Amino acid sequence: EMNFNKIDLDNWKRKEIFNHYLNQQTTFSITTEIDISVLYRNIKQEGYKFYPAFIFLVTRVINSNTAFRTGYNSDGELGYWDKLEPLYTIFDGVSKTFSGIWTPVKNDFKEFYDLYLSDVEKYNGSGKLFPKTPIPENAFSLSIIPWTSFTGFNLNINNNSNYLLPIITAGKFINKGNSIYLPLSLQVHHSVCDGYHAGLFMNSIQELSDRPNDWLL
Amino acid sequence: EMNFNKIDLDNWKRKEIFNHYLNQQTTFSITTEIDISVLYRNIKQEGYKFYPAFIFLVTRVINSNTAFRTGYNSDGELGYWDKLEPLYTIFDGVSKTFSGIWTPVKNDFKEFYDLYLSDVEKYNGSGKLFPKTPIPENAFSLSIIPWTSFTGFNLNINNNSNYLLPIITAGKFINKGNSIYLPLSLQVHHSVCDGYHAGLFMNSIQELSDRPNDWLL
Amino acid sequence: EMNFNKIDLDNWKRKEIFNHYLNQQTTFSITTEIDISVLYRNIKQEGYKFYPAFIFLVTRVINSNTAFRTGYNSDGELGYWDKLEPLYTIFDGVSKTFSGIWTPVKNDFKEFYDLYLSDVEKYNGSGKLFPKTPIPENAFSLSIIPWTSFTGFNLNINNNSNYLLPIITAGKFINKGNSIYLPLSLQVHHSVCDGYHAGLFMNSIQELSDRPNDWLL
Ligand SMILES: [Co+2]
């Protein structure tokens, strides 16, 4: 069970802004395009499938800043987890449905990649939305829409809750000559993520994509 | 009165996902740009006005998959209609206001075009938001914003309801040399439309735009 | 205290549409890219900082149409103010936090610029979200996200209120050769702003950006 660090709200420099946007129930989506040219050429050179490389990359960025890992646990306690695991989309080409499964990211990419591969074989095609349960509490949602690109994406979730963890959505590649771009939307809760943290997320994605030798190979 | 096919929720493969996103009240907007170069050149060659051609095109895509036609009727019953009619924007240049009217799409484009033309003459300039009533229940909203282009568009409708039908918004053309692009935002309810269906919508719009000889002429 | 013009709802041509979207609680965000090449070259030639020039520009557009200045005052009365003041983001590079402060725009740019400069010196680095209080009621929010560009941005504010004033968010410049583009998202309430008014806003921003000699110099 992942370590959960309970937050002392009265002794948090964010107390005012946290409570402000909690009462306003304020999240924002920010959509851009990541240049994945270097990343894609490297995964192709290695014969790695792109999706798990991208899942691993996103998870690394999530685990680089506690603002991306702050939420309420199942007992309603505010805190942040040491690391999150990705809850990511998989597709059943037959039944024409998708599922969400999770795979731990403990260390290096190859270790994750092998577990991703076996998890997809085990849990795809089940007819269940969540065939791999229980889902760990320290999880973030990573969705992909491989059938169309986009320049804007927003989720309207009017569910009476203040869910504080980041929500990530990626789209179909856009090719411009020798460049390959990945539509990417980040949706975060302003109680824990400011514009600054959104910029940190996208810039970190881009910087890691351009340095695959540092974490992939 | 359009035929409404009542859905047997207990015998629907989507039951789990439908109820999941109904409870979460989850919709999403996805914005992209359609290449309308071929479509526009063809409507210009024929001397057809672009807007009704586009209304007809969108309606054809809506009527190509039941996931785009699923909702609650006025008695609160879940089902899907055999076909939807467009409820589309018209503008009064004088009073500087807009209205929403609907025109049935029964068969071929020319038949629709003539009814569109007479409906616009009859119902524009009324000072009423909805001058043509009653509006049929089997209708979807198609809005246009011809004064500015956009790369993202989202409606925040916090209205206590689970409205399940697609919502479409188009923007001002973007010219890039010999290419013409149409900003297009699709906003759908995840209980009935997944990322897959959103991709199906945008790819169908693009494919039909590039083959106007197949449905327009 | 800014003059507030109370609206006679029963004698407003917008009564129907206003009440319609108030009950639906409908706002929309529309994101585009402004070509700021001319504006940026001019502020650079003068040695003016870009941000206050942009704040002044946005405020001029806000103060050009009453649809951008309509809201409820603190006594719950519907009306529109003669002018709004910007409530804009400032950043503390140390503590790594932001604040919102407001500076009146009474006349010419230089007058505003000098007050902006002194307000930033006085009120930055305070540790308070709103260090300059009371905030005037005739204020609109202008946020900047200078760390990343974007092509879509939406705020999901599920706060039980019908806040009717415009919300503006700008992103990091995008350079394309000799052109400089500014990501810009406008989020408005459909009770008081239609697609038309959104187009008026973006087109006015663009037109003023391209004619800085008219308001800046
Ligand atoms: Co929303």
XYZ file of C-alpha atoms and ligand atoms in Angstrom:
652
model
C 0.000 0.000 0.000
C 1.481 3.311 -1.152
C 2.580 5.724 1.554
C 0.115 8.593 2.003
C 1.462 11.781 3.583
C -1.345 13.524 5.449
C -1.403 17.287 4.918
C -1.561 19.671 7.903
C -3.900 22.196 6.294
C -3.407 24.797 9.033
C 0.367 24.615 8.436
C 0.365 24.695 4.620
C 1.388 27.811 2.746
C -1.369 26.946 0.240
C -4.141 26.982 2.859
C -5.786 30.149 1.550
C -5.647 29.285 -2.144
C -6.538 25.644 -1.475
C -9.720 26.546 0.427
C -10.550 29.330 -2.049
C -10.681 27.068 -5.112
C -12.196 24.201 -3.133
C -15.189 26.405 -2.339
C -15.321 27.620 -5.952
C -14.846 23.997 -7.148
C -12.396 25.196 -9.774
C -10.517 22.981 -12.207
C -9.063 23.939 -15.578
C -8.092 22.080 -18.722
C -5.131 23.281 -20.774
C -4.485 21.739 -24.187
C -1.321 21.958 -26.243
C 0.791 19.904 -28.644
C 3.999 18.146 -27.568
C 6.781 17.737 -30.140
C 7.397 13.976 -29.890
C 9.707 13.747 -32.925
C 12.775 12.732 -30.919
C 10.815 10.415 -28.626
C 9.113 8.632 -31.509
C 12.316 8.153 -33.497
C 13.944 6.648 -30.410
C 11.130 4.238 -29.570
C 11.060 3.168 -33.232
C 14.829 2.585 -33.211
C 14.427 0.324 -30.149
C 11.287 -1.432 -31.358
C 9.308 -0.319 -28.309
C 5.587 0.321 -28.580
C 4.861 4.020 -28.197
C 1.908 3.927 -25.790
C 3.665 2.304 -22.780
C 6.674 4.577 -23.311
C 4.291 7.532 -23.099
C 2.505 6.113 -20.040
C 5.886 5.743 -18.312
C 6.885 9.284 -19.310
C 3.684 10.840 -17.978
C 4.003 8.867 -14.743
C 7.556 10.161 -14.274
C 6.334 13.742 -14.565
C 3.442 13.060 -12.177
C 5.936 11.646 -9.683
C 8.247 14.675 -9.997
C 6.065 17.121 -8.022
C 3.713 16.620 -5.082
C 1.197 19.068 -6.598
C 0.391 16.285 -9.091
C -0.217 13.721 -6.303
C -2.454 15.541 -3.798
C -5.952 14.287 -3.081
C -8.367 12.834 -0.568
C -7.958 9.184 0.361
C -10.925 6.863 0.809
C -11.351 8.008 4.425
C -11.696 11.621 3.279
C -8.244 12.632 4.506
C -6.245 15.221 2.570
C -2.683 14.303 1.687
C -0.277 13.369 -1.066
C 1.064 9.982 -2.130
C 4.761 9.330 -2.632
C 4.042 7.992 -6.138
C 1.001 7.494 -8.352
C 0.331 4.610 -10.741
C -1.289 5.189 -14.164
C -4.872 4.089 -14.783
C -4.801 4.018 -18.575
C -7.099 3.192 -21.466
C -7.018 -0.116 -23.308
C -9.163 -1.029 -26.298
C -11.035 -4.144 -27.437
C -11.151 -3.933 -31.224
C -13.844 -6.615 -31.334
C -16.506 -5.486 -28.881
C -15.519 -1.924 -29.737
C -15.235 -0.906 -26.116
C -12.503 0.349 -23.827
C -11.406 -0.468 -20.302
C -9.265 1.196 -17.698
C -6.439 -0.780 -16.100
C -3.468 0.162 -13.939
C 0.106 -1.112 -13.899
C 2.684 -0.136 -11.252
C 5.711 1.913 -12.263
C 8.324 0.868 -9.710
C 11.685 1.535 -11.389
C 13.028 1.310 -14.951
C 11.090 1.353 -18.197
C 11.755 -2.247 -19.241
C 10.351 -3.558 -15.945
C 7.196 -1.509 -16.454
C 6.955 -2.407 -20.151
C 6.910 -6.144 -19.417
C 4.155 -5.698 -16.820
C 2.169 -3.452 -19.145
C 2.353 -6.110 -21.852
C 1.156 -8.909 -19.560
C -1.560 -6.721 -18.003
C -2.950 -5.871 -21.450
C -3.040 -9.559 -22.398
C -4.693 -10.558 -19.114
C -7.318 -7.841 -18.801
C -8.357 -6.779 -22.296
C -11.596 -7.982 -23.834
C -13.377 -8.483 -20.521
C -16.554 -6.475 -21.079
C -15.925 -4.726 -17.738
C -15.041 -1.035 -17.484
C -12.521 -1.819 -14.712
C -11.438 -5.466 -15.086
C -8.400 -5.116 -12.767
C -9.601 -4.374 -9.233
C -9.222 -3.087 -6.645
C -7.780 0.032 -8.262
C -5.117 1.600 -6.000
C -6.031 4.931 -4.460
C -2.722 6.409 -5.675
C -3.753 6.423 -9.327
C -4.249 9.056 -12.015
C -6.299 8.744 -15.210
C -4.483 8.720 -18.578
C -6.832 8.450 -21.557
C -5.997 8.248 -25.237
C -8.137 9.138 -28.242
C -6.049 7.609 -31.063
C -8.715 8.085 -33.761
C -8.613 11.857 -34.042
C -6.291 14.696 -33.232
C -7.478 17.730 -31.311
C -6.401 21.215 -30.318
C -8.845 21.509 -27.424
C -10.253 18.957 -24.988
C -12.216 19.521 -21.788
C -14.080 17.228 -19.410
C -17.256 18.612 -17.831
C -17.605 16.477 -14.712
C -20.443 17.904 -12.624
C -20.245 15.243 -9.876
C -20.512 17.151 -6.556
C -16.914 16.277 -5.650
C -13.542 17.979 -5.310
C -11.358 15.369 -6.990
C -7.882 16.849 -6.812
C -5.678 14.591 -8.953
C -4.556 15.380 -12.521
C -6.476 14.047 -15.518
C -4.552 13.508 -18.767
C -5.900 12.981 -22.287
C -3.812 12.465 -25.426
C -4.893 12.499 -29.058
C -3.844 11.150 -32.431
C -0.451 12.220 -33.720
C -0.279 15.219 -36.062
C 2.440 14.941 -38.722
C 3.983 18.140 -40.139
C 6.784 17.061 -42.467
C 9.521 15.520 -40.330
C 7.874 16.599 -37.073
C 5.364 14.591 -35.070
C 3.110 16.311 -32.536
C 1.023 14.794 -29.767
C -2.199 16.554 -28.719
C -2.180 16.619 -24.925
C -4.743 17.983 -22.467
C -4.030 18.388 -18.750
C -6.999 18.923 -16.420
C -6.104 19.863 -12.849
C -7.732 21.258 -9.730
C -6.682 24.815 -8.949
C -6.669 24.087 -5.208
C -3.442 22.136 -5.777
C -2.220 23.095 -9.286
C -1.734 26.669 -10.507
C -0.937 27.761 -14.041
C 2.662 27.383 -12.917
C 2.255 23.668 -12.180
C 0.434 23.170 -15.480
C 3.405 24.754 -17.242
C 5.757 22.585 -15.215
C 3.819 19.525 -16.370
C 3.848 20.360 -20.090
C 7.438 21.605 -20.105
C 8.580 18.472 -18.252
C 6.745 16.241 -20.749
C 8.485 18.063 -23.597
C 11.922 18.022 -21.970
C 11.736 14.302 -21.192
C 10.387 13.509 -24.660
C 13.466 15.190 -26.117
C 15.867 13.244 -23.845
C 14.714 9.614 -24.105
C 18.258 8.323 -23.520
C 17.795 9.581 -19.932
C 14.847 7.429 -18.823
C 13.780 5.088 -21.609
C 17.073 3.581 -22.776
C -43.526 12.185 -35.103
C -40.091 10.558 -35.315
C -39.842 6.946 -34.200
C -38.231 6.615 -30.764
C -36.645 3.260 -29.928
C -36.836 2.697 -26.180
C -33.635 1.276 -24.702
C -33.734 -1.819 -22.460
C -31.063 -0.650 -20.023
C -30.763 -4.042 -18.314
C -30.072 -5.627 -21.726
C -27.586 -3.065 -23.074
C -23.896 -3.853 -23.256
C -23.291 -0.210 -22.261
C -25.258 -0.484 -19.005
C -22.207 -0.212 -16.756
C -20.501 2.644 -18.583
C -23.809 4.433 -19.176
C -24.710 4.457 -15.468
C -21.111 5.259 -14.480
C -20.904 8.508 -16.459
C -24.529 9.376 -15.726
C -23.709 9.422 -12.015
C -20.501 11.371 -12.693
C -22.448 13.670 -15.082
C -19.572 13.531 -17.542
C -19.491 15.221 -20.932
C -16.444 16.255 -22.943
C -15.747 18.758 -25.687
C -13.174 17.945 -28.360
C -12.104 20.658 -30.797
C -10.253 20.210 -34.062
C -10.041 21.671 -37.563
C -11.685 20.018 -40.581
C -10.030 20.435 -43.988
C -12.984 21.737 -46.028
C -10.954 22.642 -49.137
C -12.638 20.074 -51.381
C -16.096 20.709 -49.930
C -15.826 24.470 -50.339
C -14.546 24.291 -53.913
C -17.463 22.015 -54.787
C -20.169 24.155 -53.198
C -18.666 27.204 -54.930
C -18.674 25.394 -58.287
C -22.394 24.619 -57.819
C -23.338 28.020 -56.422
C -24.663 26.496 -53.201
C -24.445 28.423 -49.949
C -21.955 26.779 -47.615
C -23.908 26.811 -44.343
C -26.849 24.575 -45.402
C -24.420 22.183 -47.100
C -22.585 21.928 -43.779
C -25.825 21.511 -41.806
C -26.803 18.649 -44.131
C -23.349 17.073 -43.791
C -23.390 17.179 -39.993
C -26.914 15.750 -39.933
C -25.802 12.850 -42.140
C -23.032 11.995 -39.691
C -25.415 12.290 -36.731
C -27.781 9.899 -38.495
C -24.997 7.380 -39.211
C -24.646 6.058 -35.637
C -27.178 5.592 -32.844
C -24.646 6.831 -30.259
C -25.279 10.315 -31.700
C -29.080 9.986 -31.291
C -29.550 8.635 -27.750
C -31.379 10.678 -25.141
C -34.373 10.997 -22.861
C -37.698 11.898 -24.437
C -40.107 14.346 -22.825
C -41.583 11.565 -20.667
C -38.140 10.795 -19.240
C -37.738 7.570 -21.209
C -34.294 6.540 -22.446
C -34.009 5.620 -26.104
C -32.685 6.621 -29.494
C -34.432 8.239 -32.448
C -34.170 6.859 -35.965
C -33.047 10.288 -37.221
C -32.381 13.712 -35.728
C -33.142 17.098 -37.284
C -30.717 20.044 -36.939
C -31.589 22.970 -34.679
C -29.224 25.548 -36.144
C -28.289 29.182 -35.651
C -29.632 31.987 -37.813
C -28.682 35.645 -37.521
C -30.557 38.954 -37.732
C -28.002 41.497 -38.919
C -30.299 44.347 -37.892
C -31.313 43.599 -34.316
C -27.935 41.922 -33.905
C -29.427 38.808 -32.386
C -29.600 35.138 -33.271
C -32.333 32.525 -33.250
C -32.466 28.770 -33.357
C -34.652 27.077 -35.962
C -34.953 23.513 -37.226
C -35.525 22.131 -40.714
C -36.156 18.437 -41.462
C -33.591 16.470 -43.444
C -35.699 13.795 -45.127
C -33.723 12.765 -48.225
C -31.471 14.561 -50.724
C -29.604 17.820 -50.282
C -31.608 19.899 -52.763
C -34.870 19.059 -50.973
C -33.359 20.157 -47.667
C -31.722 23.241 -49.198
C -35.044 24.566 -50.506
C -36.683 24.101 -47.096
C -33.729 25.697 -45.330
C -34.013 28.720 -47.611
C -37.747 29.167 -46.998
C -37.391 28.549 -43.246
C -34.717 31.253 -42.982
C -36.938 33.725 -44.843
C -39.985 32.880 -42.717
C -38.424 32.804 -39.263
C -35.516 35.246 -39.215
C -35.841 38.658 -37.616
C -38.541 37.624 -35.159
C -37.034 38.786 -31.871
C -37.748 35.321 -30.425
C -34.990 32.882 -29.470
C -37.051 29.983 -30.884
C -39.465 31.398 -33.487
C -40.311 27.976 -35.004
C -42.134 25.873 -32.410
C -42.753 23.280 -31.229
C -39.175 22.084 -31.661
C -39.100 18.320 -32.363
C -37.647 16.169 -29.613
C -35.354 14.462 -32.149
C -33.144 17.512 -32.616
C -29.486 18.347 -32.046
C -27.937 21.804 -31.647
C -25.598 23.109 -34.380
C -24.190 26.563 -33.637
C -21.905 28.707 -35.749
C -19.570 31.505 -34.688
C -18.694 33.013 -38.095
C -16.934 36.091 -36.667
C -13.866 34.409 -35.226
C -11.940 31.209 -35.625
C -10.988 29.092 -32.639
C -8.833 26.143 -31.665
C -10.740 25.376 -28.470
C -14.403 25.722 -27.523
C -16.240 24.352 -24.497
C -19.723 24.864 -23.084
C -20.049 24.871 -19.291
C -23.702 23.968 -18.792
C -24.280 23.421 -15.075
C -28.032 22.722 -15.389
C -28.720 19.688 -13.140
C -29.534 17.509 -16.161
C -28.051 14.600 -18.088
C -28.713 15.798 -21.628
C -27.283 13.049 -23.796
C -27.382 14.381 -27.368
C -24.378 15.813 -29.248
C -23.718 19.555 -29.325
C -21.835 20.969 -32.325
C -20.159 24.363 -32.717
C -18.308 25.600 -35.803
C -16.102 28.653 -36.213
C -14.862 31.024 -38.886
C -12.823 29.517 -41.695
C -9.026 29.573 -41.392
C -7.223 30.020 -44.723
C -3.699 28.594 -45.132
C -2.707 29.157 -48.756
C -4.916 26.935 -50.905
C -6.360 25.104 -47.898
C -9.463 26.090 -45.964
C -10.031 24.777 -42.441
C -13.197 24.771 -40.367
C -12.904 24.985 -36.566
C -15.265 22.358 -35.177
C -16.092 21.439 -31.580
C -18.062 18.317 -30.645
C -19.489 18.108 -27.117
C -20.935 14.730 -26.155
C -22.048 12.830 -23.076
C -19.707 10.004 -22.125
C -22.639 7.799 -21.093
C -23.381 7.349 -24.807
C -20.273 8.605 -26.676
C -16.714 7.446 -25.978
C -13.539 8.889 -27.448
C -14.114 6.322 -30.176
C -17.464 7.835 -31.175
C -15.963 11.326 -31.083
C -13.281 10.126 -33.493
C -15.943 8.495 -35.636
C -17.773 11.823 -35.773
C -14.768 13.939 -36.788
C -13.381 11.372 -39.221
C -16.813 10.990 -40.844
C -17.145 14.778 -41.197
C -13.738 14.881 -42.881
C -14.395 11.899 -45.148
C -17.748 13.264 -46.316
C -16.309 16.752 -46.803
C -13.734 15.238 -49.149
C -16.377 13.305 -51.147
C -19.117 15.867 -51.855
C -20.052 14.138 -55.127
C -21.429 11.342 -52.900
C -24.126 13.248 -50.991
C -24.267 16.862 -52.131
C -24.282 16.569 -55.924
C -17.097 54.211 -6.632
C -17.794 53.248 -10.248
C -21.228 54.091 -11.607
C -23.473 51.022 -11.833
C -26.374 51.195 -14.287
C -29.209 49.019 -13.013
C -30.851 46.932 -15.733
C -34.649 46.950 -16.173
C -34.990 43.255 -16.990
C -38.627 43.561 -18.082
C -37.584 46.268 -20.574
C -34.477 44.582 -22.012
C -34.523 43.052 -25.465
C -32.305 40.285 -24.033
C -34.818 39.283 -21.345
C -35.678 35.938 -22.931
C -32.135 34.867 -23.771
C -30.787 36.231 -20.482
C -33.234 34.190 -18.382
C -32.821 31.148 -20.650
C -29.061 30.816 -20.138
C -29.296 31.896 -16.503
C -31.523 28.894 -15.814
C -29.223 26.649 -17.868
C -26.182 28.241 -16.136
C -24.383 28.399 -19.464
C -20.929 29.850 -20.032
C -18.499 29.043 -22.832
C -14.763 29.323 -23.324
C -13.377 30.117 -26.769
C -9.631 29.881 -27.367
C -7.677 31.301 -30.274
C -4.311 32.866 -31.089
C -3.849 36.624 -31.540
C -1.169 37.833 -33.963
C 0.770 40.223 -31.702
C 3.679 40.786 -34.116
C 2.946 44.481 -34.647
C 2.096 45.091 -30.990
C 5.257 43.408 -29.739
C 7.544 45.225 -32.171
C 6.017 48.524 -31.060
C 6.317 47.901 -27.325
C 9.922 46.783 -27.880
C 10.675 49.948 -29.872
C 9.343 52.052 -26.964
C 10.936 49.982 -24.210
C 7.569 49.252 -22.605
C 6.997 45.988 -20.773
C 4.556 43.817 -22.693
C 2.267 42.649 -19.879
C 0.885 46.069 -18.798
C 0.430 47.039 -22.452
C -1.658 43.889 -22.873
C -3.615 44.531 -19.661
C -4.436 48.033 -20.931
C -5.444 46.657 -24.341
C -7.782 44.041 -22.882
C -9.329 46.631 -20.567
C -10.006 48.919 -23.537
C -11.885 46.136 -25.306
C -13.826 45.290 -22.136
C -14.810 48.949 -21.854
C -15.944 49.116 -25.500
C -19.183 47.125 -25.063
C -21.615 46.842 -22.159
C -22.011 43.089 -22.777
C -18.514 42.740 -21.274
C -19.477 44.714 -18.129
C -22.815 43.212 -17.038
C -23.133 41.457 -13.699
C -24.696 41.400 -10.262
C -23.403 43.872 -7.698
C -22.848 42.921 -4.068
C -26.516 43.605 -3.266
C -27.601 41.106 -5.924
C -28.760 43.781 -8.362
C -28.350 43.222 -12.099
C -26.692 46.000 -14.059
C -23.616 47.098 -15.951
C -20.712 49.293 -14.882
C -19.497 52.210 -16.970
C -15.950 50.794 -16.873
C -14.208 47.760 -15.404
C -10.727 47.608 -13.880
C -8.411 44.618 -14.487
C -7.720 42.148 -11.684
C -4.541 40.601 -13.058
C -1.971 37.999 -12.083
C 1.382 38.860 -10.548
C 4.100 36.374 -9.648
C 6.534 35.957 -6.749
C 9.532 34.132 -8.193
C 10.780 33.324 -4.693
C 7.815 31.808 -2.880
C 6.677 30.474 -6.245
C 3.159 31.763 -5.805
C 0.902 34.229 -7.566
C -1.429 36.980 -6.429
C -4.241 38.935 -7.978
C -4.136 42.731 -7.849
C -6.087 45.475 -9.596
C -4.992 48.832 -10.985
C -7.409 51.470 -12.328
C -7.343 52.355 -16.016
C -8.564 55.952 -16.039
C -7.145 57.470 -19.240
C -3.919 57.067 -21.232
C -1.492 54.167 -21.207
C 1.432 55.959 -19.556
C -0.735 56.942 -16.574
C -1.819 53.328 -16.149
C 1.701 51.983 -16.726
C 3.148 54.066 -13.885
C 0.430 52.870 -11.495
C 0.876 49.270 -12.605
C 4.598 49.524 -11.895
C 4.105 50.948 -8.395
C 1.290 48.493 -7.594
C 3.503 45.537 -8.540
C 6.307 46.838 -6.314
C 3.949 47.475 -3.391
C 1.881 44.299 -3.460
C 4.058 41.486 -4.791
C 5.606 38.932 -2.470
C 2.934 39.244 0.205
C 1.909 35.614 0.655
C -1.738 36.692 0.275
C -3.877 35.697 -2.709
C -5.434 39.192 -2.770
C -2.987 41.615 -1.110
C -4.734 44.763 -2.439
C -8.204 45.014 -0.899
C -11.006 45.800 -1.077
C -11.217 44.699 -4.706
C -13.633 46.949 -6.646
C -16.849 45.312 -7.776
C -16.265 46.599 -11.327
C -13.379 44.230 -12.006
C -12.669 41.423 -14.460
C -10.102 38.632 -14.103
C -7.090 38.576 -16.464
C -4.761 35.629 -15.867
C -1.511 34.776 -17.596
C 0.226 31.419 -17.933
C 3.647 32.531 -19.242
C 5.296 29.104 -18.850
C 3.462 27.243 -21.586
C 1.505 27.995 -24.703
C -1.895 26.456 -25.318
C -4.507 26.027 -28.017
C -7.350 25.270 -25.614
C -8.124 26.477 -22.095
C -11.312 26.088 -20.071
C -12.234 26.798 -16.461
C -14.679 24.389 -14.812
C -16.120 26.498 -12.003
C -18.969 24.547 -10.413
C -19.749 27.165 -7.730
C -23.575 27.474 -7.655
C -23.412 31.031 -9.018
C -24.230 32.928 -12.198
C -21.144 35.128 -12.418
C -21.693 37.142 -15.572
C -18.418 38.988 -16.212
C -15.772 37.924 -18.757
C -12.791 35.809 -17.716
C -9.581 36.134 -19.750
C -6.544 33.842 -19.812
C -3.419 34.328 -21.927
C -0.566 31.921 -22.581
C 3.088 31.916 -23.552
C 3.968 33.433 -26.906
C 4.270 31.108 -29.908
C 6.944 32.168 -32.413
C 6.536 31.191 -36.087
C 9.386 32.843 -37.978
C 8.796 36.595 -37.892
C 5.315 36.224 -36.399
C 4.468 36.142 -32.708
C 1.160 34.687 -31.528
C -0.540 35.021 -28.162
C -2.759 32.167 -26.933
C -5.926 33.788 -25.612
C -9.013 32.236 -24.020
C -12.222 34.188 -23.401
C -14.795 32.671 -21.032
C -18.155 34.441 -20.946
C -21.694 33.873 -19.729
C -24.174 33.296 -22.537
C -26.861 35.271 -20.692
C -24.933 38.427 -21.621
C -22.416 37.383 -24.324
C -23.320 35.504 -27.511
C -20.907 34.062 -30.044
C -21.199 37.473 -31.667
C -19.809 39.271 -28.609
C -17.026 36.699 -28.310
C -16.090 37.442 -31.917
C -16.289 41.154 -31.200
C -13.880 40.652 -28.302
C -11.264 38.668 -30.239
C -11.510 40.799 -33.375
C -11.178 43.979 -31.294
C -8.104 42.578 -29.513
C -6.549 41.798 -32.895
C -7.461 45.141 -34.461
C -6.076 47.127 -31.526
C -2.936 44.985 -31.387
C -2.292 45.894 -35.018
C -2.811 49.644 -34.394
C -0.733 50.401 -31.283
C -0.083 53.978 -32.444
C -3.795 54.567 -31.705
C -3.876 53.834 -27.962
C -0.412 52.947 -26.700
C 1.774 55.681 -28.190
Co -17.420 22.863 -17.034
